[PDB]
Amino acid sequence: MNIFEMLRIDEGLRLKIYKDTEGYYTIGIGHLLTKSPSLNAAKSELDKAIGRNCNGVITKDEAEKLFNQDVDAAVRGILRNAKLKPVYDSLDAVRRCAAINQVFQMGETGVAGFTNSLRMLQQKRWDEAAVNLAKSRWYNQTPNRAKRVITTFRTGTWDAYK
Numbered sequence: 682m683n684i685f686e687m688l689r690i691d692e693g694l695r696l697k698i699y700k701d702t703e704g705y706y707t708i709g710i711g712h713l714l715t716k717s718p719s720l721n722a723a724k725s726e727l728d729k730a731i732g733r734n735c736n737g738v739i740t741k742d743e744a745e746k747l748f749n750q751d752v753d754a755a756v757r758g759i760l761r762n763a764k765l766k767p768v769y770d771s772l773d774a775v776r777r778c779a780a781i782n783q784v785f786q787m788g789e790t791g792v793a794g795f796t797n798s799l800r801m802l803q804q805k806r807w808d809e810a811a812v813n814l815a816k817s818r819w820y821n822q823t824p825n826r827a828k829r830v831i832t833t834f835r836t837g838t839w840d841a842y843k
């Protein structure tokens with residue numbers, strides 16, 4: 682297991698534009714295209730991202746290329762965020778994957794309300810952090826995925842992903 686295999690499990694792979702769990706146009710391995718309800722706007726974003734006229738469809742190689750960029754950008758973002766970097770750097774590599782997973786799904790803005798969880802993670806109070814993480818819109822809206830990510834934060838193992 683690694684971050685790519687983990688997010689591949691959580692996000693799936695679809696080669697045609699689909700709506701994510703929040704109803705937003707997405708493609709590939711959870712590549713958010715736009716929050717716009719206009720499918721044409723999503724298609725424009727897709728063509729811009731891939732560099733050709735896709736007509737709402739991409740290849741597996743193209744999906745994987747976006748995924749690489751997205752994972753990379755998530756990490757680089759975390760490192761530029763003054764609230765996140767100290768916590769991220771305090772973690773072992775497995776728990777860092779859980780951090781990347783959460784940011785990939787929710788964005789840095791999504792993690793803004795997680796101040797108390799973040800402190801508990803930095804303190805390595807793993808069971809307490811796990812309890813706090815579940816008191817969230819995130820957990821309520823995507824409980825099976827959040828449970829996997831939280832188990833990863835709690836244990837620093839890949840037990841939830843087998």
Ligand SMILES: O=[N+]([O-])c1cccs1
Nearest residue numbers: 765768769780783792
């Ligand atoms: O950067 N971090 O240690 C993070 C943990 C959870 C969301 S981001």
